[PDB]
Amino acid sequence: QSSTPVCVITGSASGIGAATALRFAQAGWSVAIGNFDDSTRDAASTVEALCRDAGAQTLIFDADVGKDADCRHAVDMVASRWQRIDALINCAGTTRVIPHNAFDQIDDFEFERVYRVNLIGLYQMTRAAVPLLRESASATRSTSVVNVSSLAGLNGTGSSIAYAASKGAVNTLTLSLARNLAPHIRVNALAPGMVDDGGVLSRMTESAPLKRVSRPAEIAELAWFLTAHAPAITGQVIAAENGLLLG
Amino acid sequence: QSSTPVCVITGSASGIGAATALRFAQAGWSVAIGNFDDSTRDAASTVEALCRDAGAQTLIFDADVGKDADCRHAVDMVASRWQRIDALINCAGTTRVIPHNAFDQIDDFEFERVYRVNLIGLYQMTRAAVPLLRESASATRSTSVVNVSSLAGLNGTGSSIAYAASKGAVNTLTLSLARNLAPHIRVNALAPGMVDDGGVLSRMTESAPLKRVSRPAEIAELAWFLTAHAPAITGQVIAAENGLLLG
Amino acid sequence: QSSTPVCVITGSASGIGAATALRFAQAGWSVAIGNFDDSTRDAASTVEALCRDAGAQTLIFDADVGKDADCRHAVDMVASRWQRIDALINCAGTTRVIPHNAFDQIDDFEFERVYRVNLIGLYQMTRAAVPLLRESASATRSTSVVNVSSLAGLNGTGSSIAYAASKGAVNTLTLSLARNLAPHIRVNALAPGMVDDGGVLSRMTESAPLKRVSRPAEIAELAWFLTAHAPAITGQVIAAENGLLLG
Amino acid sequence: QSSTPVCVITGSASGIGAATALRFAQAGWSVAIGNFDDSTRDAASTVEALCRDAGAQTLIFDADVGKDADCRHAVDMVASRWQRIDALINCAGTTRVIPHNAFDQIDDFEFERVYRVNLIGLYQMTRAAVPLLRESASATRSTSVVNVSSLAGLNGTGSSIAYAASKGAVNTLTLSLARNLAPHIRVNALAPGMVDDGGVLSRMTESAPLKRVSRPAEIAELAWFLTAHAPAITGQVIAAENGLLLG
Numbered sequence: 001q002s003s004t005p006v007c008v009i010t011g012s013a014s015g016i017g018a019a020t021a022l023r024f025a026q027a028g029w030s031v032a033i034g035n036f037d038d039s040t041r042d043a044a045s046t047v048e049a050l051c052r053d054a055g056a057q058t059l060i061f062d063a064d065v066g067k068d069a070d071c072r073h074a075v076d077m078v079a080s081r082w083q084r085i086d087a088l089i090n091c092a093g094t095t096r097v098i099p100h101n102a103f104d105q106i107d108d109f110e111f112e113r114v115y116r117v118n119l120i121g122l123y124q125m126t127r128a129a130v131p132l133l134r135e136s137a138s139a140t141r142s143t144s145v146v147n148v149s150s151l152a153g154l155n156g157t158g159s160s161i162a163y164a165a166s167k168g169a170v171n172t173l174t175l176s177l178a179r180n181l182a183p184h185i186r187v188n189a190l191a192p193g194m195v196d197d198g199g200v201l202s203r204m205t206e207s208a209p210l211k212r213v214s215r216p217a218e219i220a221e222l223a224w225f226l227t228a229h230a231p232a233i234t235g236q237v238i239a240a241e242n243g244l245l246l247g
Numbered sequence: 248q249s250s251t252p253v254c255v256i257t258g259s260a261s262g263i264g265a266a267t268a269l270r271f272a273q274a275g276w277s278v279a280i281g282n283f284d285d286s287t288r289d290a291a292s293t294v295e296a297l298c299r300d301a302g303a304q305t306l307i308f309d310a311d312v313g314k315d316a317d318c319r320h321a322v323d324m325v326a327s328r329w330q331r332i333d334a335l336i337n338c339a340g341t342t343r344v345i346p347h348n349a350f351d352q353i354d355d356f357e358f359e360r361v362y363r364v365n366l367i368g369l370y371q372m373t374r375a376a377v378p379l380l381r382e383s384a385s386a387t388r389s390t391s392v393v394n395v396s397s398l399a400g401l402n403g404t405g406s407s408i409a410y411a412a413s414k415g416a417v418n419t420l421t422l423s424l425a426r427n428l429a430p431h432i433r434v435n436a437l438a439p440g441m442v443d444d445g446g447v448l449s450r451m452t453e454s455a456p457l458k459r460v461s462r463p464a465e466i467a468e469l470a471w472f473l474t475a476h477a478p479a480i481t482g483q484v485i486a487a488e489n490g491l492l493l494g
Numbered sequence: 495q496s497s498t499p500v501c502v503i504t505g506s507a508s509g510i511g512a513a514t515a516l517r518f519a520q521a522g523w524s525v526a527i528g529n530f531d532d533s534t535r536d537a538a539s540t541v542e543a544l545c546r547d548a549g550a551q552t553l554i555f556d557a558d559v560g561k562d563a564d565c566r567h568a569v570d571m572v573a574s575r576w577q578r579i580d581a582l583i584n585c586a587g588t589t590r591v592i593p594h595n596a597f598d599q600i601d602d603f604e605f606e607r608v609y610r611v612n613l614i615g616l617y618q619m620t621r622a623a624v625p626l627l628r629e630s631a632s633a634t635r636s637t638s639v640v641n642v643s644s645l646a647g648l649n650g651t652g653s654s655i656a657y658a659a660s661k662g663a664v665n666t667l668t669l670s671l672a673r674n675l676a677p678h679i680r681v682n683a684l685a686p687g688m689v690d691d692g693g694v695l696s697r698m699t700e701s702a703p704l705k706r707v708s709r710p711a712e713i714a715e716l717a718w719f720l721t722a723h724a725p726a727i728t729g730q731v732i733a734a735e736n737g738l739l740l741g
Numbered sequence: 742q743s744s745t746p747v748c749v750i751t752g753s754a755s756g757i758g759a760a761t762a763l764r765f766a767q768a769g770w771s772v773a774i775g776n777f778d779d780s781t782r783d784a785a786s787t788v789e790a791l792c793r794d795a796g797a798q799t800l801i802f803d804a805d806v807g808k809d810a811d812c813r814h815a816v817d818m819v820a821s822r823w824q825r826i827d828a829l830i831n832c833a834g835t836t837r838v839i840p841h842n843a844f845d846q847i848d849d850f851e852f853e854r855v856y857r858v859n860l861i862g863l864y865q866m867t868r869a870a871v872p873l874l875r876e877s878a879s880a881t882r883s884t885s886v887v888n889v890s891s892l893a894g895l896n897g898t899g900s901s902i903a904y905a906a907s908k909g910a911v912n913t914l915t916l917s918l919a920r921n922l923a924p925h926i927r928v929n930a931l932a933p934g935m936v937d938d939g940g941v942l943s944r945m946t947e948s949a950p951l952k953r954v955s956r957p958a959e960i961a962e963l964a965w966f967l968t969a970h971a972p973a974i975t976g977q978v979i980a981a982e983n984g985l986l987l988g
């Protein structure tokens with residue numbers, strides 16, 4: 001196996017996942033960059049170029065995490081290259097903006113579409129990685145799963161009620177996974193508030209007590225911290241939302 | 248419209264729903280008894296007989312709440328009979344026992360099967376009832392939606408990880424519904440722990456600080472209380488679990 | 495001992511405690527009406543007259559709950575009269591409005607003054623009642639302690655930061671008491687939002703999603719429900735705040 | 742003012758505070774090492790020697806944080822030396838082991854003794870530092886207050902019920918401070934579980950899902966992370982308890 005630790009990142013073509021691949025690359029880790037499909041591949045290739053410039057060994061895998069076979073194939077590709085997985089950051093996700101009071105404009109199709117990526121896909125990726133995650137834990141150090149949830153899962157706001165529901169499920173799923181994968185693997189979730197992937201900006205900033213929005217790099221820092229420097233933290237949902245929970 | 252208030256209960260053929268139909272019947276309300284299918288109809292008919300003996304006007308409707316048309320037809324039947332809905336108690340649900348650490352024995356099919364009843368079906372029933380629920384609210388009194396969630400949604404335990412995830416989604420969905428249906432409709436969830444529908448009993452009792460299990464009637468009392476006597480309570484998840492959350 | 499159950503209410507001269515004494519009186523219980531001092535005695539006597547009109551046996555006791563001897567003497571008076579205690583409702587409390595951002599206008603004196611009534615006094619009253627509470631539990635039914643906390647304890651708002659802190663302590667204290675007095679005694683807290691004891695009204699109503707304020711009788715109903723109809727509920731903080739937690 | 746950022750640490754003579762002073766020293770910050778009294782001074786001097794070896798400018802101050810004048814004098818000493826405060830880590834605290842079910846072995850004296858250090862003292866230190874904390878914030882970066890609370894504040898366990906209550910108050914106080922000091926100062930709390938300051942060890946490890954105890958350095962890492970790398974995090978209580986909350 002490789003003598004350098006390995007991080008697997010789904011949703012790695014953009015946003016939080018892209019920023020997280022870069023942060024692990026800056027730490028010297030090898031990064032498995034999870035690309036969605038042909039529409040995201042150019043972005044993924046730029047992420048890979050930046051991670052290599054940061055000094056990391058890289059590989060790109062395609063996976064629709066809603067398909068269990070795609071999750072298994074992705075882990076097989078990582079296993080063949082480095083024979084270890086030290087962290088999995090589940091950033092793959094989807095939504096569609098639908099007002100929560102427009103009951104007539106959402107349907108079961110959309111509840112399932114969002115749940116398939118955000119919850120089932122997140123579980124399937126984690127399950128596929130568990131054997132290597134457990135094997136890569138040492139006598140003294142546990143490995144790390146980080147689930148990107150949302151403030152929406154905590155308080156029922158967000159882009160749609162189907163999105164909020166799926167993130168509430170992610171929060172609870174994180175608890176089960178933490179309980180059942182202890183002591184070798186720690187499992188935590190992150191609950192970002194407003195994130196600017198680069199008027200709308202000035203409206204998000206004023207409503208927040210901290211009078212700012214988050215950039216993806218901050219969420220990457222939290223994923224890195226939970227992985228590298230938090231051996232006692234498991235089963236938590238960490239909210240990084242610029243004070244919105246305070247009102 | 249009818250001069251007597253109306254309660255609609257899904258999952259009313261057995262367990263908590265059956266007990267809740269009876270409790271509303273004892274209060275003098277008319278009850279719309281939600282039966283699942285032919286396999287549950289005999290139980291539903293017994294529930295109806297008991298509610299009529301308690302003095303309530305009754306009707307039985309069939310509905311697979313996972314089918315939106317079934318939810319709409321059910322509300323149409325209630326509207327035609329009494330032209331009002333004053334409370335909806337979402338007790339329809341499903342699960343299958345699968346150990347949370349048997350990762351190889353659950354699949355996406357089961358995650359979707361459970362979510363379809365517990366979350367999508369609960370939303371679809373609530374949405375179908377919202378017009379009448381809002382119309383039945385008065386200048387002084389809001390109507391009531393009660394969602395039967397589970398301790399599993401709070402802490403990630405329970406019959407399966409797919410069940411726990413679906414109940415975490417119910418908890419978050421309850422928040423969105425409460426926020427967006429205020430002020431005319433209050434929306435709350437209940438989180439029962441161990442419930443005996445009538446060794447296994449002695450194992451549940453010893454692990455609980457209160458050294459007992461719940462019977463369905465207690466959960467019905469809570470649903471009735473939240474509906475009839477709690478005009479300030481909305482967006483809450485009330486845990487009735489015999490102290491299990493204390494350890 | 496008396497064949498009628500007994501409720502002890504501190505803070506019973508006014509507000510929530512007065513309403514709670516009345517609600518237990520309406521249920522047929524004997525009520526021990528906890529009066530503060532000479533300044534509240536006339537109000538307490540009116541509460542007693544109303545409880546007797548409701549048909550309840552009554553007694554009035556004076557107690558400054560911050561003084562442990564006053565708590566012990568009060569329980570001795572109740573023991574001598576009826577030789578049982580079936581519920582204790584801790585409504586004694588104090589505060590003073592000080593803006594949370596006026597750091598220069600609160601001091602350690604006020605933190606201690608509020609904590610002495612709201613937390614120490616609540617503990618001392620509960621401790622004094624525990625022997626009779628445990629003895630009055632039956633083979634099938636636990637007795638009940640209800641602590642009146644506040645929304646302020648949940649989210650750090652409220653009349654002052656010293657008040658909010660004291661109510662956060664009440665919430666945690668409720669957990670310890672519930673864990674350690676199980677299975678014979680259940681211990682729960684209530685977290686009211688805006689309560690009108692009878693412009694200010696229209697400002698409270700508009701900010702609440704439910705577009706109303708609470709009256710003391712609603713909080714009394716919750717204390718009665720938790721005592722009489724909730725054998726599985728212990729260690730909970732029930733928020734009745736007209737939706738303010740939703741934003 | 743100094744061109745190097747400044748961290749003020751109470752409770753800095755030992756345990757988490759000592760480890761936190763060292764971690765900030767390793768980051769290049771100047772550290773104000775808060776010593777309690779003559780009994781802790783030798784330990785504080787060793788902490789200072791280690792921080793200087795790590796390359797940090799240092800000063801030691803004495804303060805009984807329960808005395809407001811001691812908090813003001815301490816901040817005056819820091820202001821005179823460096824004219825800035827960029828972070829305050831409130832680690833001063835006290836307790837005494839008393840079983841939560843030994844109601845007869847705790848008194849109001851002990852509730853006040855613990856509250857005076859853990860809550861009033863923490864507030865008084867924070868208040869004294871607020872002017873410099875706000876002035877040291879920049880147009881782009883907020884300063885940081887980190888309160889060392891406890892798992893006991895979350896679930897009512899811990900060394901005594903008076904300790905648990907005081908930490909529940911710390912949790913709520915953290916919310917008020919975060920809300921009212923935004924946007925210039927972020928305020929967060931840490932909730933450690935079992936911490937070994939160096940049979941008892943093997944009993945703590947087995948009960949934890951992560952099968953370990955924490956060492957003070959891990960809590961220092963969390964305090965450092967929240968200060969240096971978490972511009973969106975405020976009003977949170979971060980639990981680092983080796984999975985104990987999972988059961």
Ligand SMILES: Nc1ncnc2c1ncn2[C@@H]1O[C@H](COP(=O)(O)OP(=O)(O)O)[C@@H](O)[C@H]1O
Nearest residue numbers: 011013014015016036063064065092093094117
């Ligand atoms: N079914 C899927 N399988 C894998 N990746 C997916 C799937 N659906 C969406 N994604 C990817 O997940 C990522 C979502 O991240 P993004 O939409 O950029 O916002 P944030 O950084 O706030 O999550 C994108 O790269 C998207 O292409």
Ligand SMILES: Nc1ncnc2c1ncn2[C@@H]1O[C@H](COP(=O)(O)OP(=O)(O)O)[C@@H](O)[C@H]1O
Nearest residue numbers: 258260261262263283310311312339340341364
């Ligand atoms: N898809 C569905 N649509 C409507 N009702 C359903 C559906 N699936 C299951 N149910 C019903 O929901 C109820 C679940 O309640 P029960 O299984 O008796 O346990 P508890 O009382 O603890 O909920 C049953 O009546 C079941 O038949």
Ligand SMILES: Nc1ncnc2c1ncn2[C@@H]1O[C@H](COP(=O)(O)OP(=O)(O)O)[C@@H](O)[C@H]1O
Nearest residue numbers: 505507508509510530557558559586587588611
């Ligand atoms: N130290 C004390 N001991 C006993 N009762 C007290 C003490 N301090 C205040 N009280 C009483 O507690 C009650 C507080 O209730 P109230 O102030 O009317 O508002 P709410 O009904 O919202 O609690 C009052 O009767 C007050 O006199």
Ligand SMILES: Nc1ncnc2c1ncn2[C@@H]1O[C@H](COP(=O)(O)OP(=O)(O)O)[C@@H](O)[C@H]1O
Nearest residue numbers: 752754755756757777804805806833834835858
């Ligand atoms: N009143 C006080 N004022 C200032 N510091 C105090 C006060 N009381 C206790 N302390 C200090 O607070 C620190 C508590 O930390 P410690 O007892 O070593 O355990 P942990 O590292 O788990 O907090 C000690 O240095 C103690 O001397």
